[PDB]
Design a protein around this ligand. Structure first.
Ligand SMILES: C=C(NCc1c(COP(=O)(O)O)cnc(C)c1O)C(=O)O
Ligand SMILES: C=C(NCc1c(COP(=O)(O)O)cnc(C)c1O)C(=O)O
Ligand SMILES: C=C(NCc1c(COP(=O)(O)O)cnc(C)c1O)C(=O)O
Ligand SMILES: C=C(NCc1c(COP(=O)(O)O)cnc(C)c1O)C(=O)O
Lengths: 481, 481, 488, 488
């Protein structure tokens, strides 16, 4: 039945890996008390981490169930679907794993984020952008849902399962998701899921309608005028023909700021899930808050006085990371320390460029650069070396690697110092350039600058202080010719 | 022992969820034959999807093992670590789940990508950037590894486990990862893992050194001068003091282009993993290619003539999506169709703004805008309406929702049309503005333009062709006053 | 005693030669400056300006140019004239080379730092300019500056000629020949002669002449104050290497800054003595010397047995090439500001009375031609007035800046700016094509008519054949039954 | 018969009044243009230029300005002068208002489209400019243009005065009084008189005078060709509303474009008759009419019993305010290009001979002052030469553009550009602080010495007190033992 060792081999290893009946049950995890403001009221909330399927999103269940139902083995060569992201990724994976179909065309709104659009391309989707409403009605003849079902109707090699209109959508959660939650949480008193196509909620609600009729079925929609990835609003849901009205006992409306806030909290607790997951949990919070404000929370409780709630976590937060910062204030994140270093010191450092004093002077076709101030150079320097001073490097200035502002000034002055004319004015091109400063640190920054400009540059570890220590017998010129 | 139902409840649900002994074994999946160029030679390659731990990366094993070893319950209040990303995310999760520590400070190179830096902030890390080499030696006194261990040495409330120097790193894979692969693949003939801190490889190599001494242990390093997230090069690995030289039988060197290529292929097969995972598989490919070129591949084979290879998949590709496009050519991705629509039609469309002809004219404080050409307006128009023509909208021009170039021209001309002066010149401010065109489509684009500018605008579904059809009794002015 | 042209009429094939001749010409005018410009008038000094700017060439250097070329040019060998110059000398050489000697290949060696307006002036007069990058006013023997290299090129070629104003005695001798004797005859009671020093030819000539012709006249040279720069003269330091006997030609030397030079030059112009910065530079030196003797109480000595003291100073050229510098050197005061200055950036295009049509002629042309293919009528009124009554077949393009209350844009500059800007912002290329205005007669009707004429200026600048209905909508009220009926 | 100033010397408290008086002044010069400019010289026509630009005011409008103000000004009531103008008239009014009438509050009403150089010129002459946005050359009765509004303001206030050049007969009567009689006396054989028409005062005056004083002279007016624009005149269409009897003053009217006007004005200047665009505009009209009769073979009739035909045309003002337009209107030819033009953008800063020091004086100052606190020595040579031998205590700042082979930057313009650019790019603010040059005496040593002087120009423009070692490293070879020993 199920894979005990979670080990999949043979020609069908990937098929069985994605199989919800063969792979272990999708994890169900109770959220911590610190995140559950109804813990003292006896509420225990459990998160169904659909993001932990190998596909990383809840829409793998409709995609699996639809494709096995609708694919015709000899003739089905192309799959087309309108989607907000998750379904077409799941269709792309299942079409290859189960059906050998690599031509998957994704129809998406032109107002889907750039990271999400790049993720579609990443998974090998062929995407076409559509103007107008990002969430059109399946009968809006100007929208991508209509165009998709009409392109597969004129060509039998083209297949359009219809996640907005194909019953195999919600039946996938009667088949898999529902029974899993029931076995994992036999004391379940409330099931909660947000509604986009509504397939997830109606599937769960149709299953629990007869598997445990005492279970309360709570769907979540996006507040009017708001937008969150995954669900749609109550208005955008009315034209859909799935039996969602028979699968829910109450509807909550949730905004995007709460959704992204709770998703961020869940991820920091260890339950890594995306914005719609925090959206769902917030809807559950809002309904529990009504029953407490109405004094009716006792109605959900079982014989032990506890209320076991399960809610769906639909996918991962990674595709939406930038949106968390646009929607949530800076107060939700620690700022970067030494943030200025992101725009500077951009180039690599190789340990082989840093040479011990004896090793560097043995190679010395070759040119030695001294980056100390002009009067320090005249006082004493290695005979044969050129002087090239810097405003930002004294004998007293701190090491650039201990002061981010020093590193910024020194790196920038070094980038401006080593212009093209400068390289030729000192004959650095094509030679082994050895660099020396006071303690070696500014010189090492200079090697990163020069290596990125193609000059074979090395630095002396410890600077001139180490050559005076390690090589005390090498006598030094003290402006004398 | 292990959680049969994958259901975690009680105050320790999250602790047990992250527990590798309590949670099902990390999946091991054989890669498809199409991705395995040595399938006919009898090689079967199995991927250990460490990315499928709830933390989504392999470094959860060192983080778990180190923190339980080093945390002192009463005094340990702050955790500090230098990392390339994975470890500090895993330390942030485990420090909160197992030890109640929320003060986690991450020391990172200034040359880590911006998406990765934002991911650190996302998971609640307090990050400080460090110049110089992005992968310093643990004894480089200018690098972040030294600074981390020295800041926890001066303060007992500060804890620095040392992933580069703490043996609990690699022992975590002797404890968990090794035994899991052995039980999942008893016929294992070769174990493969890339080396950054080397903890993963030495742990696996120390375990199999005595669990099944016939197993070949293959480590992978980054080719000289190259860079891939996770591992380091053979040179950057020499100073580390873990017994990695006793845990490997051969070393492969792999470049970044191959690493990102194979990761992309793995993700498109259904094994969603990041660049170091394709890096590892490529190293395995390169060693198998030597033995075939040397005719020695038979040496790895078991009694049935097959060679069972296991390799580590370390994390997910999502934080690196943009890097795949910089490293791989455009030839690896389908381009966006109607790409021009990404920069235009930027605003939302609400179904309630589109009104049937009878419904819109019933509300008609109110102003009706007609967007048809001037001669068409004079020919016949709804009495009481203003005319506002557009260069890009004829009676013959196609619907904007069927031609992306038409949508771009019309939307841009509409954005330029409805300037501030225009809004006041037609008294649109504060009124209910109804918009009419030929077929309704240009008018609907105009409502998205005007709603985003704060004007309460609605369109007539079907345009003037529908008011002539649905309302044939409403007589129309035909430039007559 | 040569006679001068009493009719100032110059005919014949030598009309231009005689016109430029300081002996045929009337004498260069000498004009006493007014009291309001003479601080020492109450002390008996009379300051007379020698307006060298009034020669046909407009500058003092026509005298050295005439004299040097007459001396140096070889009728059959000379074919090219080359000279280093700051501007005046080489313009004068171009004129004399052609008028008097039939030479047009005149090359001008100039500093690379002379102003961009001045460089164009050299081109304007048909000069051939080569730039030299060293010091602006080099020493004549500096083997880098143009003075030396111009001299050597004239040595290598026997067909080209460098008269060299910097050490040819004919330079300063031309003022012994003309300027000196003229001033002496125009002002016999003269007691002091003043001139700035660039090459020092003008001052050397005046001082050498008056040294013997009237030894009692004081000779006052003017040099540029160190660190400063004035067009024409040189600083004392920059003047020492020239070998003209200028030290023997002056009895004292003043130093003057550029701010004072431009200020006094500007005041002389507003008095009617139109002259450039070096003229105010010379007058300021004279003021400074006269103020030195007045404060020391030695002012009386310069006089004679008469109480008056007659001083003459040189006015070298005209201010027009330097107008820009007066604004940079002097403050925002001493100039009246341009009022309605905002209009300088709007209403940039021409008007034509033919574009403004009587209402009956305009409505006749509109309904003559088929509507929407040959002619359109734009009605700029607010949409709720347009709806009430309008010319059938016309288009409504509302203007926010225009309504039934707005006054004439030509009576308020802010209205003109707002309305011209909105009209310019209204008639984008899409708007022209949205109403298909191209190739059509366009008629404009507004509340005003003045606004509508502004609209015709804007549209015809864009190539649209637009005309306005004179008098506005008020002038066609009698042709609009619906409008007449609404007023019941 | 009033006498004229035979000395051209004007003294006394009325020196400026007499200086501007056309009756005290010598007559405005009349000068025959040369054959090279007269295509019809072989046919017996002699064309004489009346250089009105030679009045002290430099323009033709001083005659209407003098005559109108003399007529209209009220000694005790008049305190402000207001006039719409294109430029010439209102400058002349400012001068006459002060010289002759002691009035300085002169307001100038100008089109908002007059050039930015011309607007500054109005400010320069102390005028008070108000801009008007309508048509540039409005009709005198257009109640929007400045002509009408200037007239009304003078009506509301009995203390201000608009002489109104556009319909005051004293405008054209001033040329019956002066310009006409002068030309007639300067050229008694005259057969034709030619002038452009703006207000038409000049042509009306000349034509009304010659109509009776010598009825046989042909009167040839010139107007601006439709669609074109010339500074001064008007088009025939724009001229019809003025009520001067100009139609009665002309026997024919030519139309001329602006390109021909500027081309001929430029040629007249290079001949020595310095005059502006309207002057070439008048001459081109005369050429066009004479070419019409020559092609028709009716040229002989204009003559007399003599074979010659003497024509006079007006030259109105000077070209200097319009120099920019000649470049825009005419091609790149007719001007010589500036050679070494690249130098105009480099070597922007001054030089001083005191900065260049004899080698012994430079090395003396350097080792006098303590090194690195009061003085530094920069050695611009290549690092491998600097290592071989250098002045002890000096810093090496290599230049790629300079080495022992490079010639003098003042002998090759490309070397000067490269070296000045690299020196400017070398001495960034960090470089000055990297060697702590601020507040120190700085001495420059190079292979050349010329390069080192360029370096001193660059550094002193940045405030660094830099001097150069004259003669370069070659001049200090005797002071360098190590260098002498290497040459064995
Ligand atoms: C509609 C699809 N999204 C459903 C979805 C939902 C909503 O689940 P539904 O089955 O559509 O009701 C929630 N969260 C995420 C991340 C989702 O992708 C889609 O990818 O086309
Ligand atoms: C060093 C850590 N990275 C190790 C790593 C590796 C290498 O595994 P090691 O245990 O360091 O040898 C591979 N792939 C990814 C994504 C990784 O993050 C870190 O996050 O600090
Ligand atoms: C040197 C020349 N300038 C002399 C000059 C002077 C000086 O006059 P000198 O005769 O050169 O000393 C004053 N004012 C103006 C306008 C001048 O042009 C020249 O044109 O090259
Ligand atoms: C109208 C005036 N211009 C007349 C003019 C003319 C025309 O001359 P009239 O006398 O205005 O017809 C020609 N050339 C120049 C340079 C002029 O300035 C004026 O100054 O306002």
């Amino acid at each position: 039945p199920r894979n005990l060792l979670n080990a999949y081999a043979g020609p069908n290893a990937l098929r069985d890996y994605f199989d919800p009946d063969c792979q272990p049950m999708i994890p169900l995890v109770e959220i911590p008390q610190s995140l559950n403001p109804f813990y003292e009221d006896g509420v225990r909330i459990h998160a169904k981490m659909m993001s932990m399927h190998p596909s990383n999103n809840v829409k793998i269940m409709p995609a699996l169930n639809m494709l096995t139902k609708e694919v015709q083995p000899e003739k089905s060569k192309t799959v087309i679907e309108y989607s907000s992201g998750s379904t077409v990724i799941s269709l792309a994976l299942v079409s290859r794993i189960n059906h050998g179909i690599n031509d998957v065309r994704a129809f998406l709104s032109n107002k889907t984020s750039a990271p999400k659009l790049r993720l579609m391309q990443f998974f090998g989707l062929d995407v076409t952008l559509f103007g107008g409403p990002s969430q059109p009605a399946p009968n809006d003849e100007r929208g991508g849902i209509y165009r998709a079902r009409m392109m597969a109707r004129e060509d039998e090699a083209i297949l359009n399962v219809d996640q907005y209109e194909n019953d195999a959508n919600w039946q996938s959660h009667v088949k898999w998701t529902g029974p899993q939650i029931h076995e994992q949480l036999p004391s379940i008193r409330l099931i909660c899921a947000g509604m986009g196509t509504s397939g997830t909620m109606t599937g769960l609600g149709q299953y629990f309608k007869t598997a445990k009729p005492s279970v309360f079925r709570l769907g979540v929609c996006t507040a009017a005028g708001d937008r969150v990835p995954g669900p749609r609003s109550l208005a955008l849901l009315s034209p859909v023909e799935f039996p969602w009205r028979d699968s829910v006992d109450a509807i909550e409306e949730v905004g995007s700021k709460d959704a992204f806030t709770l998703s961020l909290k869940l991820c920091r607790e260890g339950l890594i899930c995306g914005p719609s997951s925090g959206f769902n949990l917030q809807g559950l919070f809002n309904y529990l808050g009504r029953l407490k404000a109405a004094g009716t929370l006792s109605s959900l409780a079982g014989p032990y006085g506890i209320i076991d709630c399960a809610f769906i976590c639909c996918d991962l937060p990674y595709p939406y990371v930038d949106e968390y910062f646009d929607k949530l204030g800076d107060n939700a994140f620690h700022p970067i320390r030494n943030q200025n270093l992101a725009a500077v010191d951009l180039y690599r450092y190789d340990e082989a460029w840093e040479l011990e004093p004896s090793s560097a002077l043995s190679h010395f076709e070759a040119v030695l650069l001294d980056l100390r101030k002009p009067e320090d150079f005249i006082m004493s320097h290695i005979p044969g070396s050129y002087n090239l001073p810097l405003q930002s490097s004294n004998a007293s200035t701190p090491s650039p690697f201990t002061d981010a502002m020093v590193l910024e000034k020194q790196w920038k002055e070094l980038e401006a110092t080593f212009t093209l004319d400068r390289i030729n004015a000192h004959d650095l091109s094509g030679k082994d350039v050895y660099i020396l400063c006071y303690n070696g640190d500014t010189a090492r920054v200079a090697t990163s600058v020069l290596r990125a400009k193609g000059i074979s540059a090395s630095s002396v570890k410890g600077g001139i202080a180490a050559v005076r220590k390690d090589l005390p017998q090498m006598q030094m010129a003290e402006g004398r010719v």
